[PDB]
Design a protein around this ligand. Structure first.
Ligand code: ANP
Ligand code: K
Ligand code: K
Ligand code: K
Ligand code: MG
Ligand code: MG
Length: 299
């Protein structure tokens, strides 16, 4: 931190204590955030932000450099061939993917399957020239369970059928039970803490994304506050995904809010499930057929 202009030893200490440890957070911070640190003037605040942006080369980029940025995105396999295809490879890091679906469509299954697949290194697709092994080494998952449907048994099961050690999945997945939107949001904001503590958080699951908000803001006479809070929650999620190059998944029970990728899942015949990609920034809408068995997502 003392590398930054306007940052002395005493200032560095305040910064690390206020949770500002890495350059990107400072580079992307506002003067307000930094001035609420006490002992930090605005001039010093503005100087370090400018410095952080420069040390992180956050300026205009063109030509080939535009390709390199996009190459830092790695993807997580879903164990479904058709789904990975419709996804253009698999679930993208640096983005928020949503699986909306009717009751029992498999939203929660996909979340569990994703935590398991994170532990199979061959399920993380990436350009080894833009993403080093170390960056995806000892990957960990954060599971914000708002429904109370996290099932370690399902994790163990999905894991064995994948030839992955179940306990290892459990040992590398942080679960937080949220009972309302307040807890749901705070847990997400605290993910930074797990990372500063040395945890290579690469997957974040929010199941469910909307249940709490709908339950608390029932009265459609204050839907504004609702949209606001949630919007702020999505901002936090998108930033988290970009800055920590990790995949963010969210579920939504349906039978408006921000989401980079949008799916609507429905039940087919028995095992069958039909997921429809109806919105994304660079891919055409498409359908993916797969099934949910004792092994998890397959085909
Ligand atoms: N151990 C298992 N073996 C085989 N199939 C399973 C197993 N566990 C769950 N399933 C399937 O997963 C379905 C439930 O998927 P689920 O992820 O709970 O849907 P959902 O969309 O999250 N439901 P909801 O949260 O209520 O809206 C079941 O009804 C089973 O068909
Ligand atoms: K300095
Ligand atoms: K079922
Ligand atoms: K979108
Ligand atoms: Mg993003
Ligand atoms: Mg569910």
């Amino acid at each position: 931190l003392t590398d930054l202009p306007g940052v002395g030893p005493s200032t560095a200490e305040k910064l690390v204590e206020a949770g500002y440890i890495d350059f990107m957070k400072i580079a992307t911070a506002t003067v307000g955030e930094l001035t609420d640190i006490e002992g930090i003037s605005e001039k010093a605040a503005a100087k370090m932000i400018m410095g952080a942006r420069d040390l992180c080369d956050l300026g205009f980029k063109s030509g080939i450099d535009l390709l390199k940025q996009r190459s830092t995105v790695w993807k997580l396999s879903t164990s479904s061939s058709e789904l990975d295809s419709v996804l253009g490879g698999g679930l993208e890091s640096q983005s928020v993917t949503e699986f909306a679906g009717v009751f029992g469509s498999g939203k929660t299954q996909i979340m569990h399957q994703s935590c398991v697949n994170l532990q199979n290194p061959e399920f993380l697709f990436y350009d080894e020239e833009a993403v080093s092994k170390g960056e995806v080494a000892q990957p960990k998952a954060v599971y914000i369970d708002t429904e109370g449907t996290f099932r370690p048994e399902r994790i163990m099961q999905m894991a064995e059928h994948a030839g992955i050690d179940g306990q290892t999945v459990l040992d590398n997945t942080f679960v937080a039970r949220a009972y309302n939107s307040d807890m749901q949001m705070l847990f997400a904001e605290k993910i930074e803490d797990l990372i500063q503590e040395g945890n290579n958080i690469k997957l974040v699951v929010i199941d469910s994304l909307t249940s709490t908000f709908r339950n608390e803001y029932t009265g459609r006479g204050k839907l504004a506050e609702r949209q606001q809070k949630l919007g702020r929650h999505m901002a936090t999620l998108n930033k988290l995904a970009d800055l920590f190059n990790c995949v963010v998944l969210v579920t939504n029970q349906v039978s408006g809010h921000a989401a980079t990728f949008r799916f609507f899942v429905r039940k087919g015949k028995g095992d069958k499930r039909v997921a429809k990609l109806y919105d994304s920034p660079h891919l055409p809408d498409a359908e993916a057929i797969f099934r949910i068995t004792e092994k998890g997502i397959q085909d």
